Motif scaffolding. Structure first.
Motif, mmCIF file in Angstrom:
data_model
loop_
_atom_site.group_PDB
_atom_site.id
_atom_site.type_symbol
_atom_site.label_atom_id
_atom_site.label_comp_id
_atom_site.label_asym_id
_atom_site.label_seq_id
_atom_site.Cartn_x
_atom_site.Cartn_y
_atom_site.Cartn_z
ATOM 1 N N UNK A 7 0.767 -1.240 0.078
ATOM 2 C CA UNK A 7 -0.063 0.050 0.084
ATOM 3 C C UNK A 7 0.811 1.369 -0.093
ATOM 4 N N UNK A 8 1.791 1.468 0.879
ATOM 5 C CA UNK A 8 2.475 2.826 1.239
ATOM 6 C C UNK A 8 3.572 2.983 0.117
ATOM 7 N N UNK A 9 4.310 1.907 -0.310
ATOM 8 C CA UNK A 9 5.340 2.006 -1.320
ATOM 9 C C UNK A 9 4.892 1.084 -2.664
ATOM 10 N N UNK A 10 5.325 1.173 -3.826
ATOM 11 C CA UNK A 10 5.050 0.756 -5.250
ATOM 12 C C UNK A 10 5.496 -0.803 -4.901
ATOM 13 N N UNK A 11 5.165 -1.465 -6.051
ATOM 14 C CA UNK A 11 5.591 -2.936 -6.121
ATOM 15 C C UNK A 11 6.986 -3.428 -6.054
ATOM 16 N N UNK A 12 7.776 -3.011 -6.969
ATOM 17 C CA UNK A 12 9.223 -3.487 -7.138
ATOM 18 C C UNK A 12 9.835 -2.565 -6.047
#
Length: 15
Positions: A7-12
């Motif tokens: 949620x708070x950071x992107x995927x990679x």
């Protein structure tokens, strides 16, 4: 091939 994403950071963004 479905990997959950944060949620708070992107995927990679976990790296």
């Amino acid at each position: 091939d479905w990997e959950y994403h944060a949620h708070p950071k992107p995927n990679s963004x976990w790296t």
